[PDB]
Amino acid sequence: FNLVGVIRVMPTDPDVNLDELEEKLKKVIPEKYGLAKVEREPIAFGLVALKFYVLGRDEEGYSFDEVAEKFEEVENVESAEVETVSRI
Amino acid sequence: KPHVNIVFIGHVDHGKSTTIGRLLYDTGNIPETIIKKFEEMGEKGKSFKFAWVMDRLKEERERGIDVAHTKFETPHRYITIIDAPGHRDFVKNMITGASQADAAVLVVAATDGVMPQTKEHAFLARTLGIKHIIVTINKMDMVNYDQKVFEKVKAQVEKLLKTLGYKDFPVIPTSAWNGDNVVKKSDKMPWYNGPTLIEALDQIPEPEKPIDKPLRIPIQDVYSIKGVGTVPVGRVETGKLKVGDVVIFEPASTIFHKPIQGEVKSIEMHHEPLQEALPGDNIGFNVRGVSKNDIKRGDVAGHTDKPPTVVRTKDTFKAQIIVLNHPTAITVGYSPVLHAHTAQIPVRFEQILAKVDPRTGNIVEENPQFIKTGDSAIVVLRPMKPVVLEPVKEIPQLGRFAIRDMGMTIAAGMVISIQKG
């Protein structure tokens, strides 16, 4: 890997089980991507974002945007948006 | 004390990553655990050690042992760095994705000099609204520390940045692999008397948050929260939002032919109430009298006196683009997807007014029959669904866009002007 992309996942509701949601999101990251860590970031009125530090490669064929679409299909996800992209 | 956000740019083999590596290593900002573990190996020579240590730093990052940023303190600032992806597909993520960089470091190798890429890196720096550049002419060892090569590459790097409206910026001859002029002053280039790179970082001007500009908050998500009501979530880009302010949402209000607006009751950032929100704060806020169904992602909040500018289907806007990639050629009628702030909308290329020279900024051909990969151009676009955009000289934060099509990033652009029709 030589690229980290931070993907911000918002839950559908403040009462979403975030442990359950994290586990589900982890299973839909495609095999050629990796995962450095997941952080939780409280936003507002009880909504907590999950921030996935997705590992990838700075090449054609890799897209953190496609990882975010896999995430948007998972139950209890409102949105997934790529924040930061940066080489390591 | 002041925080500055820096983005390193340049051709991905010209040493910019190594430059960031050298900054951390020579300021002593390597984890003690790594440095102690290397000592077990005994003598390996300086070069082996720096390479091994930077490789160990990458592994710690990848294991989640700062992952996405490099951070260090200087005498007068906290510096956060981003090492920008060079592949053109990620440009949409740069334009649309997170924080304002205060400064860019463009690293250009003495050897190869300016590359076809470089004009793209420059234009991208401007498009992101980055106020200050620092230039680094790197790998000076591979050209024997020669002044007359440094000056050529400096001069031609200067034209690209000058054309974009950069000037009076540092241009520093460095070697990232050996250290010359990154943090340690060189002995190999007495002909150079400017700052070292870490000196240039320390002297980036403290950032002025755009609080003077009209309030703009692009909306990311929209919730109905039991017991509180309608809560937009977005980052304030410009201006300031205070509790009790009235805000209006566009293009919601234009689309529905009525004010989709109301009073701000509370504001939260990181689950803490705020009385006011400033540029860069990612907030949820409770707006009274607005239905959750009447606002969505891509709408933008504004004060009622200075509401967000809507470009309707009946209107068009002028833009300046760089064509990053297209498998054939762009022609009038081309209809890709425009991504700006939190909005995305189909757009129509209505005219191609000019092909521009990124070395001088001057019209090289009026009304070209098409443009293709690597052209810089002035086009006229028509949104196929309404969108909020601002002229870049008024509100740069809402004047930058990316063009997407057939899966890939086609163009990056800046909004010059808006014509009501």
UniProtKB/Swiss-Prot annotation, chain A:
InterPro entries: eEF-1beta-like_sf, EF1B_bsu/dsu_GNE, Transl_elong_EF1B/ribsomal_bS6, Transl_elong_EF1B_B_arc. Keywords: Elongation factor, Protein biosynthesis. It holds the Pfam family EF1_GNE. This is Elongation factor 1-beta. The keyword Nucleotide-binding does not apply. Promotes the exchange of GDP for GTP in EF-1-alpha/GDP, thus allowing the regeneration of EF-1-alpha/GTP that could then be used to form the ternary complex EF-1-alpha/GTP/AAtRNA. HAMAP family: EF1_beta. Belongs to the EF-1-beta/EF-1-delta family. SUPFAM superfamilies: eEF-1beta-like. GO terms for molecular function: translation elongation factor activity.
Swiss-Prot record, chain B:
Pfam families: GTP-eEF1A_C, GTP_EFTU, GTP_EFTU_D2. Residues 1-211 form the tr-type G domain. Keywords: Cytoplasm, Elongation factor, GTP-binding, Hydrolase, Magnesium, Metal-binding, Nucleotide-binding, Protein biosynthesis. Residues 83-86 are annotated as: G3. Residues 64-66 are annotated as: G2. InterPro entries: EFTu-like_2, G_TR_CS, GTP-eEF1A_C, P-loop_NTPase, Small_GTP-bd, T_Tr_GTP-bd_dom, TRAFAC_GTPase_members, Transl_B-barrel_sf. One of its GO terms (cellular component) is cytoplasm. Residues 138-141 are annotated as: G4. The keyword Nucleotide-binding applies. It catalyses: GTP + H2O = GDP + phosphate + H(+). It is found in: Cytoplasm. Residues 175-177 are annotated as: G5. Residues 10-17 are annotated as: G1. Its EC number is 3.6.5.3. Its main location: cytoplasm. It comes from the Archaea. One of its GO terms (molecular function) is GTPase activity. The keyword Heme does not apply. GTP binds at residues 10-17, 83-87, 138-141. Mg(2+) binds at residue 17. HAMAP family: EF_Tu_A. GTP hydrolase that promotes the GTP-dependent binding of aminoacyl-tRNA to the A-site of ribosomes during protein biosynthesis. Belongs to the TRAFAC class translation factor GTPase superfamily. Classic translation factor GTPase family. EF-Tu/EF-1A subfamily. This is Elongation factor 1-alpha. It comes from Pyrococcus horikoshii (strain ATCC 700860 / DSM 12428 / JCM 9974 / NBRC 100139 / OT-3).
